[PDB]
């Protein structure tokens, strides 16, 4: 895995910001794209754009084959059994809302529980808050251990025979914790619940196998895994999708439309109303080809190396707190003593370094951590230890700078 | 308005299909894009992709300014009063579903009516069928005149003081009828109803001014108006949006998130959950710049010329029926006597000509027309009378061909 050759394929990395080489450490907010993806969108619009399905003309057939071809690439990439289980959506957040609307609101009654965790992103909190309110069900939270991991004993305690849904992040976008999803799914199913996995931060960075995880639903975003913005996937087990009604209604997802009553297409098109995200889906297929050619296991090993190196170098800094466990995904969320994280991020950008400051869409977790905001550097397949050295050197200089004033 | 110079900007037009120059007459299914749009997406991914809002680093500020900058371009392009009224969605179909979910299902009771027309596309039928079923309200249809137009007397008859919503196409994707929306809005408001306009087929082809039309909601798709796939807009009057709850929930559309309760951001971000369609929205802003530079009035005059020319040349063909009125948008839906429209479209594609065959997502209208399917040629700013001559010559040869066998 050669990082010079990988970085050569991402044109956006090769520029300066405020007279310094760009050091982009915000891939957990969104990833950059290689030429293979950007040129896939260009070839689509330059050569074979047309509306899809009902193919009667040559470009329409090409666009259709491109779109459904990318559906198969996604199925194989997460090891789903069938394309009927692979729904294209505009992103993880819409995918989780579709489960909350079509699955939860149809299957919750007073006394039923939805169980989530304190480390969830808002996308995997607020849909459930709304579904429980709509149904008169109850929302419960699995507690965290002190290092920001989840113990399976707490899971077993929280999940009961009244639990109908457990929803949980695969990887936390703040703590970098990798949650024990396959063992959580067993505990959910033992209790009669389904498990909904928010895979937005795992899919880019490590192999996903939905048959091994045995998750009932899994959600992911293209823009985090070198793919175009505006597209995502909802995977669901086919027997659950078959029984769920559509979340949105219109052309393309019908079989018959009468004046008052309509019937739906088979899966997966039952869940894809209107002209679909044609270019974006084909470009997400190109991103999957690109990552597969590098190897997700290789990208996970590179990130493990960067994270171990970052954690060590952060421990060399006085007056810096890092949140979450030692074993983690490729990101470090932190605070400097006595400097607001927004000011940390502002002065890092003056040195060309891009990081994110705020609550990272995890307000209950910031409350759990007893902080109002944090800064986060996150890494991906094009980042290097030299960039981490630049970050830690800039944090040192930030600390001294705010000391002198 | 020089059509050679306009066509030079669309790389996809310059190729052959089955050894003939491509003749693309399916822009009502989706439009082609000029280099100005495709190179806008390329510059985004090559130079300033980053997640938007909460801007702390230089690329993030650039992407944010690009995204909200395109929101302002849309506001000015439809003459809305405020950016708070301009919501980015994945397309017309999602925009109309958001109104049906957040407005209709909150505001309909038994005895209330939703009034639509027989010429509606499924996107502007099935959401209402579902909202009325959910609420126990009643769905009603405005009848059509024999040429496929709507009379305002029928509107006045159909809409009553129990009507809460009238939903109607601006332009029909099958008949080419331009509906009298501004006078329909007056009849709706006189009765205490709001009017929801499906603008998917008007926005690409003629100036939209939502203040003059006085519509309460207006929906449109980027992919039909030279813009990227996967993006659309919902316009709503601000006082109506302020009272509607979000259709989807997650990060970015919150202000405060507690364990059980959350509060929403102000408009328009209250309706934009999760990382938005960043590249696609910026590219739809580039498409609007492109169309504005040509002039929507000029594009409407060009299409009026093409439609008048097509209708005349179709009347020269024996054994061909054209559906809908003489005064129309730039499309012609038709059937050959005794040839199935799918076979018409197949043999036209063998001559390089791209048209669409089927129900065009308007099954109740096909039933009204007493046909099971139709063929449709549709035109846009890059099409020419020579291409129409090629179509009518091929229809003649199709007729003779199926006669000889």
Curated annotation (Swiss-Prot), chains A, B:
One of its GO terms (molecular function) is pyridoxal phosphate binding. Homodimer. Interacts with SufU; this interaction induces an opening of the active site pocket of SufS. Interacts with frataxin/Fra. The active site is at residue 361. Keywords: Pyridoxal phosphate, Transferase. It catalyses: (sulfur carrier)-H + L-cysteine = (sulfur carrier)-SH + L-alanine. The keyword Transferase applies. Type II cysteine desulfurase that acts as the initial step in the SUF-like Fe-S cluster assembly pathway. Catalyzes the removal of elemental sulfur atoms from L-cysteine by using the cofactor pyridoxal 5'-phosphate (PLP), resulting in the production of L-alanine and persulfide. Activity is stimulated by SufU, which acts as a sulfurtransferase that receives sulfur from SufS via a zinc-ligand swapping mechanism and transfers it to SufB. Its EC number is 2.8.1.7. This is Cysteine desulfurase SufS. The modification N6-(pyridoxal phosphate)lysine is found at residue 224. InterPro entries: Aminotrans_V_dom, Aminotrans_V_PyrdxlP_BS, Cys_dSase_SufS, Cysteine_dSase, PyrdxlP-dep_Trfase, PyrdxlP-dep_Trfase_major, PyrdxlP-dep_Trfase_small. Its cofactor is pyridoxal 5'-phosphate. One of its GO terms (biological process) is cysteine metabolic process. The gene is sufS. It is an enzyme of class 2 (transferase). SUPFAM superfamilies: PLP-dependent transferases. Belongs to the class-V pyridoxal-phosphate-dependent aminotransferase family. Csd subfamily. It comes from the Bacteria. A Cys to Ala mutation in SufU (Cys-41-Ala) has been described to be a competivie inhibitor of SufS activity and a non-competitive inhibitor.
